[PDB]
Design a protein around this ligand. Structure first.
Ligand SMILES: [Cl-]
Ligand SMILES: [Cl-]
Ligand SMILES: [Cl-]
Ligand code: NA
Length: 124
């Protein structure tokens, strides 16, 4: 039974690579983080920074979340991210993803003690 903080780590952290280097990155990573068990998760972003740097965003720029809550924070600097999005031809259990690498600010929602990211809201 996964904690919110651990679910964020599993779904969104990939510190082992600096960037997505191939078109199949999302296919491989969505499968290995168990995001295609029982259904194809339609959209998911991976962050290629250290966990410490992502946790530090909870002390950066406080902004509104898309849902209206006020516990979201925007990173001061851009970060290396990979957006993974199901293609139109994807259908469970043969999930298929488009891989888009970018450098953008991240917006996360933070909660708890310690105060850590629990939701990925957007990137800018
Ligand atoms: Cl898992
Ligand atoms: Cl996401
Ligand atoms: Cl401010
Ligand atoms: Na938690």
């Amino acid at each position: 039974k996964e904690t919110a903080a651990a679910k964020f780590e599993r779904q969104h952290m990939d510190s082992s690579t600096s960037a997505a280097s191939s078109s199949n990155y999302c296919n491989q990573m969505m499968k290995s983080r168990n995001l295609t068990k029982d259904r194809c998760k339609p959209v998911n972003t991976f962050v290629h920074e250290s966990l410490a740097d992502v946790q530090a965003v909870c002390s950066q720029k406080n902004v509104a979340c898309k849902n209206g809550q006020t516990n979201c924070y925007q990173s001061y600097s851009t970060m290396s991210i990979t957006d993974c999005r199901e293609t139109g031809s994807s259908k469970y259990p043969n999930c298929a993803y488009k891989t888009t690498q970018a450098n953008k600010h991240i917006i996360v929602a933070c909660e708890g003690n310690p105060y850590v990211p629990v939701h990925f809201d957007a990137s800018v």
